[PDB]
Amino acid sequence: GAINLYSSRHYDTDQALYDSFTKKTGLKVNLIEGKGDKLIERIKSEGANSPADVFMTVDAGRLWRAQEAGILQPISSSTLNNKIPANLRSPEKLWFGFSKRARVIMYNKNKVQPSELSTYEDLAQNKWKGKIVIRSSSNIYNQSLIASLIEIHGMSDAEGWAKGFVRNFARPPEGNDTAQIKAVAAGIGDIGLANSYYLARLKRSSKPEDQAVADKVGMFFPNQNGRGTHVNISGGGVVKNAPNKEGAIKFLEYLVSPEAQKIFSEGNNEYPVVAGVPIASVLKPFGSFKNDSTNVSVYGKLNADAIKLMDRVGWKLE
Ligand SMILES: [Cl-]
Ligand SMILES: [Fe+3]
């Protein structure tokens, strides 16, 4: 038999993951690619006739959007639950994280010492005026981080923070996360927010210019003396009308095996979710860090609140 994997998170090194899964289970993987938001819409439009068995994407905010679109079904698996940290899976068992990213402070090593950095909250202080680069409010990674801040602080306190943060932008939000790292290297900003794997990506790049940028920028994991760093997931779930539900479950369970954890995480320079799986060589130099235990579903639950806050404080859309 086969399973139909609808994914926005496929990298061509994941073919080795699929080939191993087939060796182990006899099931072929039929890959359907698209952007995450587009795949949700595709599955919706295909209806009860959809061939989709597994949906994979990036960011708990997108997985929550899939859940709220009605396209997932809940799965109860001892393997999933024991191996995946409770904070990285849906409380309702609709979706599950399989690799982890952190939304971190990228800093210019010449301009900023890590002793100057502490928390996300500190980024609203006036000392950072004219120094921060970050991408638009249209981006799910930002939406999820701001949702986390609303959860902690409430809308009023979070708005106060966000007004100070936005006042600190060195330029209007422009470009993607990699662009912010480049802007930090170039001195356009002294600090920026981006996902951890984008710095690792530049470190590994065969392009000399990429390696040079990466060498100018450090990565700081915020809130280590408090609640921990904001982490988010690449993940997936079994689709509501999956024609091969048993096969879909086998695939999710396979993804938490140590071999699959290594291949899948390393494919995008992300961390494993499973305890004991060694981390990528490129990530070792930055060291271990405390993760916030907040359940990542909060970042979808408060997604609309985050959009409302960002608009209220004038954080530019793309
Ligand atoms: Cl929580
Ligand atoms: Fe990304």
PDB file of C-alpha atoms and ligand atoms in Angstrom:
ATOM      1  CA  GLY A   1       0.000   0.000   0.000  1.00  0.00           C
ATOM      2  CA  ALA A   2       0.806   3.708   0.174  1.00  0.00           C
ATOM      3  CA  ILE A   3       0.238   6.873   2.069  1.00  0.00           C
ATOM      4  CA  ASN A   4      -0.379  10.319   0.536  1.00  0.00           C
ATOM      5  CA  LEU A   5       1.809  12.934   2.270  1.00  0.00           C
ATOM      6  CA  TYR A   6       0.800  16.562   1.713  1.00  0.00           C
ATOM      7  CA  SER A   7       3.802  18.592   2.858  1.00  0.00           C
ATOM      8  CA  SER A   8       5.262  22.094   2.767  1.00  0.00           C
ATOM      9  CA  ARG A   9       8.290  20.962   4.732  1.00  0.00           C
ATOM     10  CA  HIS A  10       9.873  18.428   2.331  1.00  0.00           C
ATOM     11  CA  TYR A  11      13.586  18.749   1.557  1.00  0.00           C
ATOM     12  CA  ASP A  12      15.122  16.408  -0.997  1.00  0.00           C
ATOM     13  CA  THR A  13      17.260  14.708   1.789  1.00  0.00           C
ATOM     14  CA  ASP A  14      13.863  13.549   3.234  1.00  0.00           C
ATOM     15  CA  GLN A  15      13.692  11.050   0.369  1.00  0.00           C
ATOM     16  CA  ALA A  16      16.030   8.882   2.475  1.00  0.00           C
ATOM     17  CA  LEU A  17      13.480   9.073   5.293  1.00  0.00           C
ATOM     18  CA  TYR A  18      10.684   7.928   2.974  1.00  0.00           C
ATOM     19  CA  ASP A  19      12.817   5.092   1.532  1.00  0.00           C
ATOM     20  CA  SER A  20      13.614   3.841   5.046  1.00  0.00           C
ATOM     21  CA  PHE A  21       9.952   4.051   6.046  1.00  0.00           C
ATOM     22  CA  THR A  22       9.046   1.952   2.996  1.00  0.00           C
ATOM     23  CA  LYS A  23      11.701  -0.656   3.835  1.00  0.00           C
ATOM     24  CA  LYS A  24      10.333  -0.907   7.348  1.00  0.00           C
ATOM     25  CA  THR A  25       6.604  -0.908   6.657  1.00  0.00           C
ATOM     26  CA  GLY A  26       6.109  -1.802   2.991  1.00  0.00           C
ATOM     27  CA  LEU A  27       4.253   1.473   2.454  1.00  0.00           C
ATOM     28  CA  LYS A  28       5.210   3.833  -0.359  1.00  0.00           C
ATOM     29  CA  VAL A  29       5.091   7.590   0.239  1.00  0.00           C
ATOM     30  CA  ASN A  30       3.302   9.622  -2.441  1.00  0.00           C
ATOM     31  CA  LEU A  31       4.464  13.196  -1.939  1.00  0.00           C
ATOM     32  CA  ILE A  32       2.194  16.171  -2.720  1.00  0.00           C
ATOM     33  CA  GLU A  33       4.010  19.492  -2.223  1.00  0.00           C
ATOM     34  CA  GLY A  34       2.740  22.967  -1.704  1.00  0.00           C
ATOM     35  CA  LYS A  35       2.914  25.981   0.580  1.00  0.00           C
ATOM     36  CA  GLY A  36       1.351  25.209   3.930  1.00  0.00           C
ATOM     37  CA  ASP A  37      -1.578  27.567   3.660  1.00  0.00           C
ATOM     38  CA  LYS A  38      -2.292  26.387   0.120  1.00  0.00           C
ATOM     39  CA  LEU A  39      -2.228  22.734   1.119  1.00  0.00           C
ATOM     40  CA  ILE A  40      -4.820  23.394   3.813  1.00  0.00           C
ATOM     41  CA  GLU A  41      -7.046  24.958   1.188  1.00  0.00           C
ATOM     42  CA  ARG A  42      -6.405  22.058  -1.183  1.00  0.00           C
ATOM     43  CA  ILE A  43      -7.358  19.465   1.394  1.00  0.00           C
ATOM     44  CA  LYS A  44     -10.485  21.435   2.281  1.00  0.00           C
ATOM     45  CA  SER A  45     -11.544  21.663  -1.370  1.00  0.00           C
ATOM     46  CA  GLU A  46     -10.956  17.935  -1.923  1.00  0.00           C
ATOM     47  CA  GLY A  47     -13.514  17.277   0.841  1.00  0.00           C
ATOM     48  CA  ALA A  48     -14.504  13.779   1.945  1.00  0.00           C
ATOM     49  CA  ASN A  49     -12.917  12.513  -1.318  1.00  0.00           C
ATOM     50  CA  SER A  50      -9.422  13.814  -0.429  1.00  0.00           C
ATOM     51  CA  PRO A  51      -6.649  11.259  -0.803  1.00  0.00           C
ATOM     52  CA  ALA A  52      -4.487  13.073   1.811  1.00  0.00           C
ATOM     53  CA  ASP A  53      -3.341  10.849   4.615  1.00  0.00           C
ATOM     54  CA  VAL A  54      -0.743  13.006   6.394  1.00  0.00           C
ATOM     55  CA  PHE A  55      -0.406  16.813   6.439  1.00  0.00           C
ATOM     56  CA  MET A  56       2.983  18.290   7.363  1.00  0.00           C
ATOM     57  CA  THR A  57       3.909  21.951   7.658  1.00  0.00           C
ATOM     58  CA  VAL A  58       5.858  24.420   9.710  1.00  0.00           C
ATOM     59  CA  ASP A  59       4.772  26.454  12.773  1.00  0.00           C
ATOM     60  CA  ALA A  60       2.224  25.483  15.400  1.00  0.00           C
ATOM     61  CA  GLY A  61       0.206  28.500  14.204  1.00  0.00           C
ATOM     62  CA  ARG A  62      -0.231  26.823  10.808  1.00  0.00           C
ATOM     63  CA  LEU A  63      -1.022  23.453  12.357  1.00  0.00           C
ATOM     64  CA  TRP A  64      -3.641  25.119  14.524  1.00  0.00           C
ATOM     65  CA  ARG A  65      -5.079  26.746  11.375  1.00  0.00           C
ATOM     66  CA  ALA A  66      -5.319  23.278   9.835  1.00  0.00           C
ATOM     67  CA  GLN A  67      -7.037  21.949  12.935  1.00  0.00           C
ATOM     68  CA  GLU A  68      -9.515  24.806  12.958  1.00  0.00           C
ATOM     69  CA  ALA A  69     -10.172  24.300   9.225  1.00  0.00           C
ATOM     70  CA  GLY A  70     -11.437  20.855  10.197  1.00  0.00           C
ATOM     71  CA  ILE A  71      -8.927  18.830   8.177  1.00  0.00           C
ATOM     72  CA  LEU A  72      -7.320  16.733  10.943  1.00  0.00           C
ATOM     73  CA  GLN A  73      -8.337  13.779  13.100  1.00  0.00           C
ATOM     74  CA  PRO A  74      -7.057  12.954  16.592  1.00  0.00           C
ATOM     75  CA  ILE A  75      -4.592  10.124  17.134  1.00  0.00           C
ATOM     76  CA  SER A  76      -3.786   8.319  20.422  1.00  0.00           C
ATOM     77  CA  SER A  77      -0.397   6.632  20.229  1.00  0.00           C
ATOM     78  CA  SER A  78       1.809   5.645  23.190  1.00  0.00           C
ATOM     79  CA  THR A  79       4.859   6.117  20.950  1.00  0.00           C
ATOM     80  CA  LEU A  80       3.848   9.647  19.896  1.00  0.00           C
ATOM     81  CA  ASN A  81       2.912  10.710  23.346  1.00  0.00           C
ATOM     82  CA  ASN A  82       5.906   9.268  25.185  1.00  0.00           C
ATOM     83  CA  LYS A  83       8.518  10.384  22.631  1.00  0.00           C
ATOM     84  CA  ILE A  84       7.168  13.847  21.736  1.00  0.00           C
ATOM     85  CA  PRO A  85       7.313  16.376  24.645  1.00  0.00           C
ATOM     86  CA  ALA A  86       3.819  17.327  25.734  1.00  0.00           C
ATOM     87  CA  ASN A  87       4.492  21.039  24.988  1.00  0.00           C
ATOM     88  CA  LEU A  88       5.285  20.191  21.315  1.00  0.00           C
ATOM     89  CA  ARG A  89       2.025  18.338  20.528  1.00  0.00           C
ATOM     90  CA  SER A  90      -1.632  19.354  20.344  1.00  0.00           C
ATOM     91  CA  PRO A  91      -3.482  18.861  23.611  1.00  0.00           C
ATOM     92  CA  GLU A  92      -6.287  17.395  21.519  1.00  0.00           C
ATOM     93  CA  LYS A  93      -3.920  15.026  19.653  1.00  0.00           C
ATOM     94  CA  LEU A  94      -4.653  16.632  16.284  1.00  0.00           C
ATOM     95  CA  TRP A  95      -1.037  17.324  15.337  1.00  0.00           C
ATOM     96  CA  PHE A  96       2.469  16.684  16.620  1.00  0.00           C
ATOM     97  CA  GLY A  97       5.887  18.317  16.430  1.00  0.00           C
ATOM     98  CA  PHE A  98       8.734  16.331  14.818  1.00  0.00           C
ATOM     99  CA  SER A  99      11.514  18.926  14.758  1.00  0.00           C
ATOM    100  CA  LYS A 100      12.024  22.112  16.757  1.00  0.00           C
ATOM    101  CA  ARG A 101      13.187  25.659  16.000  1.00  0.00           C
ATOM    102  CA  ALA A 102      13.859  28.566  18.357  1.00  0.00           C
ATOM    103  CA  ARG A 103      12.997  32.231  17.661  1.00  0.00           C
ATOM    104  CA  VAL A 104      16.156  33.905  18.916  1.00  0.00           C
ATOM    105  CA  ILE A 105      18.020  37.167  19.069  1.00  0.00           C
ATOM    106  CA  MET A 106      20.588  37.446  16.251  1.00  0.00           C
ATOM    107  CA  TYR A 107      23.224  39.987  17.213  1.00  0.00           C
ATOM    108  CA  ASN A 108      26.118  41.772  15.495  1.00  0.00           C
ATOM    109  CA  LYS A 109      29.215  40.432  17.280  1.00  0.00           C
ATOM    110  CA  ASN A 110      31.140  43.689  16.824  1.00  0.00           C
ATOM    111  CA  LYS A 111      28.351  45.915  18.212  1.00  0.00           C
ATOM    112  CA  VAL A 112      26.654  43.775  20.833  1.00  0.00           C
ATOM    113  CA  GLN A 113      28.013  41.608  23.670  1.00  0.00           C
ATOM    114  CA  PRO A 114      25.746  38.777  24.836  1.00  0.00           C
ATOM    115  CA  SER A 115      25.906  40.324  28.314  1.00  0.00           C
ATOM    116  CA  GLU A 116      23.726  43.111  26.881  1.00  0.00           C
ATOM    117  CA  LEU A 117      20.944  40.624  26.062  1.00  0.00           C
ATOM    118  CA  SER A 118      18.455  38.962  28.391  1.00  0.00           C
ATOM    119  CA  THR A 119      14.806  38.613  27.448  1.00  0.00           C
ATOM    120  CA  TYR A 120      12.288  39.308  24.677  1.00  0.00           C
ATOM    121  CA  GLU A 121      10.752  41.864  27.042  1.00  0.00           C
ATOM    122  CA  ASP A 122      14.041  43.817  27.227  1.00  0.00           C
ATOM    123  CA  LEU A 123      13.821  44.491  23.484  1.00  0.00           C
ATOM    124  CA  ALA A 124      11.232  47.230  24.172  1.00  0.00           C
ATOM    125  CA  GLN A 125      13.726  49.280  26.214  1.00  0.00           C
ATOM    126  CA  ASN A 126      14.785  52.616  24.811  1.00  0.00           C
ATOM    127  CA  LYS A 127      18.409  51.567  24.632  1.00  0.00           C
ATOM    128  CA  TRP A 128      17.526  49.593  21.471  1.00  0.00           C
ATOM    129  CA  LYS A 129      16.110  52.595  19.567  1.00  0.00           C
ATOM    130  CA  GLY A 130      17.136  52.500  15.942  1.00  0.00           C
ATOM    131  CA  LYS A 131      18.777  49.113  16.358  1.00  0.00           C
ATOM    132  CA  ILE A 132      16.251  46.302  15.746  1.00  0.00           C
ATOM    133  CA  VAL A 133      15.489  44.542  12.461  1.00  0.00           C
ATOM    134  CA  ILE A 134      12.583  42.110  12.057  1.00  0.00           C
ATOM    135  CA  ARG A 135      10.329  40.950   9.237  1.00  0.00           C
ATOM    136  CA  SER A 136       6.728  41.873   8.700  1.00  0.00           C
ATOM    137  CA  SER A 137       3.720  41.121  10.842  1.00  0.00           C
ATOM    138  CA  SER A 138       2.369  38.884   8.024  1.00  0.00           C
ATOM    139  CA  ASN A 139       4.850  36.179   9.048  1.00  0.00           C
ATOM    140  CA  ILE A 140       3.627  33.263  11.098  1.00  0.00           C
ATOM    141  CA  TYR A 141       6.826  33.002  13.153  1.00  0.00           C
ATOM    142  CA  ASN A 142       6.300  36.567  14.417  1.00  0.00           C
ATOM    143  CA  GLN A 143       2.600  35.988  14.943  1.00  0.00           C
ATOM    144  CA  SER A 144       3.378  32.951  17.089  1.00  0.00           C
ATOM    145  CA  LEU A 145       5.975  34.793  19.155  1.00  0.00           C
ATOM    146  CA  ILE A 146       3.614  37.700  19.776  1.00  0.00           C
ATOM    147  CA  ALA A 147       0.829  35.242  20.655  1.00  0.00           C
ATOM    148  CA  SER A 148       3.164  33.839  23.300  1.00  0.00           C
ATOM    149  CA  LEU A 149       3.690  37.328  24.712  1.00  0.00           C
ATOM    150  CA  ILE A 150      -0.038  37.990  24.824  1.00  0.00           C
ATOM    151  CA  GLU A 151      -0.541  34.688  26.657  1.00  0.00           C
ATOM    152  CA  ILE A 152       2.002  35.686  29.296  1.00  0.00           C
ATOM    153  CA  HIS A 153       1.325  39.369  29.674  1.00  0.00           C
ATOM    154  CA  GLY A 154      -2.229  39.939  28.550  1.00  0.00           C
ATOM    155  CA  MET A 155      -3.215  42.289  25.773  1.00  0.00           C
ATOM    156  CA  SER A 156      -2.619  45.556  27.653  1.00  0.00           C
ATOM    157  CA  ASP A 157       0.868  44.742  28.953  1.00  0.00           C
ATOM    158  CA  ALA A 158       1.785  43.102  25.607  1.00  0.00           C
ATOM    159  CA  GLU A 159       0.662  46.181  23.729  1.00  0.00           C
ATOM    160  CA  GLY A 160       2.918  48.316  25.887  1.00  0.00           C
ATOM    161  CA  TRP A 161       5.806  46.058  25.046  1.00  0.00           C
ATOM    162  CA  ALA A 162       4.948  46.009  21.339  1.00  0.00           C
ATOM    163  CA  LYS A 163       4.744  49.829  21.125  1.00  0.00           C
ATOM    164  CA  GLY A 164       8.292  50.065  22.525  1.00  0.00           C
ATOM    165  CA  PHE A 165       9.545  47.256  20.290  1.00  0.00           C
ATOM    166  CA  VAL A 166       8.115  48.756  17.129  1.00  0.00           C
ATOM    167  CA  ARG A 167       9.553  52.172  18.121  1.00  0.00           C
ATOM    168  CA  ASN A 168      12.955  50.473  18.105  1.00  0.00           C
ATOM    169  CA  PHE A 169      12.870  49.281  14.466  1.00  0.00           C
ATOM    170  CA  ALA A 170      15.940  50.411  12.524  1.00  0.00           C
ATOM    171  CA  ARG A 171      13.962  50.266   9.275  1.00  0.00           C
ATOM    172  CA  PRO A 172      10.520  49.214   8.218  1.00  0.00           C
ATOM    173  CA  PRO A 173      10.122  45.435   8.183  1.00  0.00           C
ATOM    174  CA  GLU A 174      11.611  44.191   4.934  1.00  0.00           C
ATOM    175  CA  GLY A 175      12.560  40.707   3.665  1.00  0.00           C
ATOM    176  CA  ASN A 176      12.570  37.316   5.289  1.00  0.00           C
ATOM    177  CA  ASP A 177      14.437  35.997   8.348  1.00  0.00           C
ATOM    178  CA  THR A 178      17.659  35.472   6.393  1.00  0.00           C
ATOM    179  CA  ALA A 179      17.453  39.098   5.287  1.00  0.00           C
ATOM    180  CA  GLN A 180      17.350  40.210   8.894  1.00  0.00           C
ATOM    181  CA  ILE A 181      20.500  38.248   9.649  1.00  0.00           C
ATOM    182  CA  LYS A 182      22.204  39.884   6.681  1.00  0.00           C
ATOM    183  CA  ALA A 183      21.040  43.314   7.844  1.00  0.00           C
ATOM    184  CA  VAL A 184      22.488  42.613  11.305  1.00  0.00           C
ATOM    185  CA  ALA A 185      25.835  41.544   9.731  1.00  0.00           C
ATOM    186  CA  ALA A 186      25.879  44.700   7.625  1.00  0.00           C
ATOM    187  CA  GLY A 187      25.237  47.065  10.534  1.00  0.00           C
ATOM    188  CA  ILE A 188      21.757  48.155   9.409  1.00  0.00           C
ATOM    189  CA  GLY A 189      20.566  46.731  12.747  1.00  0.00           C
ATOM    190  CA  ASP A 190      22.508  45.621  15.808  1.00  0.00           C
ATOM    191  CA  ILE A 191      19.995  42.928  16.690  1.00  0.00           C
ATOM    192  CA  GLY A 192      17.176  41.088  14.999  1.00  0.00           C
ATOM    193  CA  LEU A 193      14.735  38.219  15.565  1.00  0.00           C
ATOM    194  CA  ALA A 194      14.930  35.118  13.407  1.00  0.00           C
ATOM    195  CA  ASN A 195      14.670  31.349  13.654  1.00  0.00           C
ATOM    196  CA  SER A 196      17.743  29.484  14.774  1.00  0.00           C
ATOM    197  CA  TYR A 197      18.079  27.304  11.645  1.00  0.00           C
ATOM    198  CA  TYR A 198      18.545  30.295   9.300  1.00  0.00           C
ATOM    199  CA  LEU A 199      21.904  31.137  10.988  1.00  0.00           C
ATOM    200  CA  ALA A 200      22.912  27.462  10.751  1.00  0.00           C
ATOM    201  CA  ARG A 201      21.920  27.443   7.095  1.00  0.00           C
ATOM    202  CA  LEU A 202      24.349  30.299   6.385  1.00  0.00           C
ATOM    203  CA  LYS A 203      27.126  28.568   8.419  1.00  0.00           C
ATOM    204  CA  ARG A 204      26.844  25.469   6.153  1.00  0.00           C
ATOM    205  CA  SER A 205      26.430  27.314   2.848  1.00  0.00           C
ATOM    206  CA  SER A 206      28.859  26.619   0.038  1.00  0.00           C
ATOM    207  CA  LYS A 207      28.683  30.359  -0.823  1.00  0.00           C
ATOM    208  CA  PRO A 208      31.645  32.301   0.753  1.00  0.00           C
ATOM    209  CA  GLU A 209      29.468  35.443   1.205  1.00  0.00           C
ATOM    210  CA  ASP A 210      26.964  33.386   3.268  1.00  0.00           C
ATOM    211  CA  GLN A 211      29.715  32.023   5.496  1.00  0.00           C
ATOM    212  CA  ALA A 212      31.064  35.537   6.046  1.00  0.00           C
ATOM    213  CA  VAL A 213      27.656  36.887   7.112  1.00  0.00           C
ATOM    214  CA  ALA A 214      27.264  33.933   9.500  1.00  0.00           C
ATOM    215  CA  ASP A 215      30.580  34.685  11.101  1.00  0.00           C
ATOM    216  CA  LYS A 216      29.496  38.260  11.977  1.00  0.00           C
ATOM    217  CA  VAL A 217      26.280  37.258  13.746  1.00  0.00           C
ATOM    218  CA  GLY A 218      25.740  35.497  17.055  1.00  0.00           C
ATOM    219  CA  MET A 219      22.660  33.670  18.318  1.00  0.00           C
ATOM    220  CA  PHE A 220      21.244  34.385  21.787  1.00  0.00           C
ATOM    221  CA  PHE A 221      18.581  32.231  23.440  1.00  0.00           C
ATOM    222  CA  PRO A 222      16.383  34.633  25.444  1.00  0.00           C
ATOM    223  CA  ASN A 223      14.742  34.299  28.836  1.00  0.00           C
ATOM    224  CA  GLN A 224      17.139  31.637  30.143  1.00  0.00           C
ATOM    225  CA  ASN A 225      16.957  32.931  33.722  1.00  0.00           C
ATOM    226  CA  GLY A 226      13.178  32.944  33.517  1.00  0.00           C
ATOM    227  CA  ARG A 227      10.586  30.952  31.567  1.00  0.00           C
ATOM    228  CA  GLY A 228      12.944  29.874  28.741  1.00  0.00           C
ATOM    229  CA  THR A 229      13.239  30.402  25.007  1.00  0.00           C
ATOM    230  CA  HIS A 230      10.309  30.459  22.627  1.00  0.00           C
ATOM    231  CA  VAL A 231      10.375  27.250  20.620  1.00  0.00           C
ATOM    232  CA  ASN A 232       8.141  26.187  17.758  1.00  0.00           C
ATOM    233  CA  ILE A 233       7.794  23.153  15.529  1.00  0.00           C
ATOM    234  CA  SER A 234       7.817  21.493  12.145  1.00  0.00           C
ATOM    235  CA  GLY A 235       4.989  19.013  12.494  1.00  0.00           C
ATOM    236  CA  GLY A 236       2.016  17.188  11.157  1.00  0.00           C
ATOM    237  CA  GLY A 237      -1.109  15.186  11.705  1.00  0.00           C
ATOM    238  CA  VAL A 238      -3.375  12.567  10.194  1.00  0.00           C
ATOM    239  CA  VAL A 239      -5.936  14.029   7.824  1.00  0.00           C
ATOM    240  CA  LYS A 240      -9.647  13.772   8.621  1.00  0.00           C
ATOM    241  CA  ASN A 241     -10.684  11.380   5.864  1.00  0.00           C
ATOM    242  CA  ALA A 242      -7.368   9.601   5.430  1.00  0.00           C
ATOM    243  CA  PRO A 243      -7.860   6.606   3.167  1.00  0.00           C
ATOM    244  CA  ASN A 244      -4.968   4.829   4.917  1.00  0.00           C
ATOM    245  CA  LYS A 245      -5.315   5.806   8.549  1.00  0.00           C
ATOM    246  CA  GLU A 246      -3.215   2.898   9.810  1.00  0.00           C
ATOM    247  CA  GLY A 247      -0.419   3.737   7.421  1.00  0.00           C
ATOM    248  CA  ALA A 248      -0.573   7.401   8.384  1.00  0.00           C
ATOM    249  CA  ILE A 249      -0.163   6.543  12.030  1.00  0.00           C
ATOM    250  CA  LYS A 250       2.766   4.247  11.171  1.00  0.00           C
ATOM    251  CA  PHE A 251       4.421   7.172   9.394  1.00  0.00           C
ATOM    252  CA  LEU A 252       4.061   9.572  12.325  1.00  0.00           C
ATOM    253  CA  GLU A 253       5.369   6.899  14.690  1.00  0.00           C
ATOM    254  CA  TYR A 254       8.309   6.264  12.370  1.00  0.00           C
ATOM    255  CA  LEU A 255       9.186   9.965  12.450  1.00  0.00           C
ATOM    256  CA  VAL A 256       9.984   9.785  16.179  1.00  0.00           C
ATOM    257  CA  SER A 257      12.497   6.979  15.756  1.00  0.00           C
ATOM    258  CA  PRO A 258      16.077   8.038  16.421  1.00  0.00           C
ATOM    259  CA  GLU A 259      17.144   7.567  12.816  1.00  0.00           C
ATOM    260  CA  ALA A 260      14.219   9.523  11.428  1.00  0.00           C
ATOM    261  CA  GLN A 261      14.649  12.234  14.044  1.00  0.00           C
ATOM    262  CA  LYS A 262      18.217  12.759  12.865  1.00  0.00           C
ATOM    263  CA  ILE A 263      17.395  12.827   9.152  1.00  0.00           C
ATOM    264  CA  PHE A 264      14.284  15.014   9.454  1.00  0.00           C
ATOM    265  CA  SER A 265      15.774  17.543  11.918  1.00  0.00           C
ATOM    266  CA  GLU A 266      19.077  17.810  10.044  1.00  0.00           C
ATOM    267  CA  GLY A 267      17.266  18.371   6.721  1.00  0.00           C
ATOM    268  CA  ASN A 268      16.533  21.924   7.838  1.00  0.00           C
ATOM    269  CA  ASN A 269      19.156  22.385  10.579  1.00  0.00           C
ATOM    270  CA  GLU A 270      16.449  22.050  13.264  1.00  0.00           C
ATOM    271  CA  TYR A 271      16.652  20.351  16.645  1.00  0.00           C
ATOM    272  CA  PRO A 272      15.091  16.925  17.308  1.00  0.00           C
ATOM    273  CA  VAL A 273      12.017  16.734  19.513  1.00  0.00           C
ATOM    274  CA  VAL A 274      12.915  13.349  20.970  1.00  0.00           C
ATOM    275  CA  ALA A 275      15.064  13.121  24.085  1.00  0.00           C
ATOM    276  CA  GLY A 276      18.434  11.589  23.604  1.00  0.00           C
ATOM    277  CA  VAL A 277      18.758  12.098  19.872  1.00  0.00           C
ATOM    278  CA  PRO A 278      22.076  13.844  19.204  1.00  0.00           C
ATOM    279  CA  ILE A 279      21.859  17.348  17.788  1.00  0.00           C
ATOM    280  CA  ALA A 280      23.345  18.511  14.485  1.00  0.00           C
ATOM    281  CA  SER A 281      27.010  19.428  14.489  1.00  0.00           C
ATOM    282  CA  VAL A 282      26.221  22.927  13.200  1.00  0.00           C
ATOM    283  CA  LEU A 283      23.982  23.550  16.268  1.00  0.00           C
ATOM    284  CA  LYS A 284      26.374  22.236  18.939  1.00  0.00           C
ATOM    285  CA  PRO A 285      28.469  25.446  19.121  1.00  0.00           C
ATOM    286  CA  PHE A 286      25.534  27.408  20.357  1.00  0.00           C
ATOM    287  CA  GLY A 287      24.985  25.011  23.289  1.00  0.00           C
ATOM    288  CA  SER A 288      21.895  23.731  25.018  1.00  0.00           C
ATOM    289  CA  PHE A 289      19.197  26.097  26.218  1.00  0.00           C
ATOM    290  CA  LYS A 290      16.109  26.098  28.384  1.00  0.00           C
ATOM    291  CA  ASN A 291      12.902  25.708  26.406  1.00  0.00           C
ATOM    292  CA  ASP A 292       9.672  27.362  27.604  1.00  0.00           C
ATOM    293  CA  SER A 293       7.190  24.643  28.557  1.00  0.00           C
ATOM    294  CA  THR A 294       4.215  26.547  27.095  1.00  0.00           C
ATOM    295  CA  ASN A 295       2.135  24.329  24.895  1.00  0.00           C
ATOM    296  CA  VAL A 296       2.736  25.487  21.306  1.00  0.00           C
ATOM    297  CA  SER A 297      -1.035  25.269  20.538  1.00  0.00           C
ATOM    298  CA  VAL A 298      -1.308  28.591  22.486  1.00  0.00           C
ATOM    299  CA  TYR A 299       0.433  30.276  19.572  1.00  0.00           C
ATOM    300  CA  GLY A 300      -2.421  29.311  17.239  1.00  0.00           C
ATOM    301  CA  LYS A 301      -5.145  29.961  19.782  1.00  0.00           C
ATOM    302  CA  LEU A 302      -3.897  33.543  20.129  1.00  0.00           C
ATOM    303  CA  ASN A 303      -2.917  34.034  16.451  1.00  0.00           C
ATOM    304  CA  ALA A 304      -5.788  36.431  15.736  1.00  0.00           C
ATOM    305  CA  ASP A 305      -5.017  38.371  18.907  1.00  0.00           C
ATOM    306  CA  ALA A 306      -1.429  38.729  17.738  1.00  0.00           C
ATOM    307  CA  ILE A 307      -2.565  40.045  14.322  1.00  0.00           C
ATOM    308  CA  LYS A 308      -4.857  42.558  16.088  1.00  0.00           C
ATOM    309  CA  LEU A 309      -2.031  43.723  18.368  1.00  0.00           C
ATOM    310  CA  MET A 310       0.480  44.053  15.543  1.00  0.00           C
ATOM    311  CA  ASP A 311      -1.947  46.186  13.533  1.00  0.00           C
ATOM    312  CA  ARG A 312      -2.750  48.343  16.582  1.00  0.00           C
ATOM    313  CA  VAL A 313       0.905  49.254  17.104  1.00  0.00           C
ATOM    314  CA  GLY A 314       1.676  49.777  13.419  1.00  0.00           C
ATOM    315  CA  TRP A 315       3.937  46.816  12.788  1.00  0.00           C
ATOM    316  CA  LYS A 316       3.893  46.797   9.010  1.00  0.00           C
ATOM    317  CA  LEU A 317       2.342  43.972   7.002  1.00  0.00           C
ATOM    318  CA  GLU A 318       4.164  42.490   3.974  1.00  0.00           C
TER     319      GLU A 318
HETATM  320 CL    CL B   1       0.351  26.226  28.048  1.00  0.00          CL
HETATM  321 FE    FE B   2      11.349  28.816   7.890  1.00  0.00          FE
END
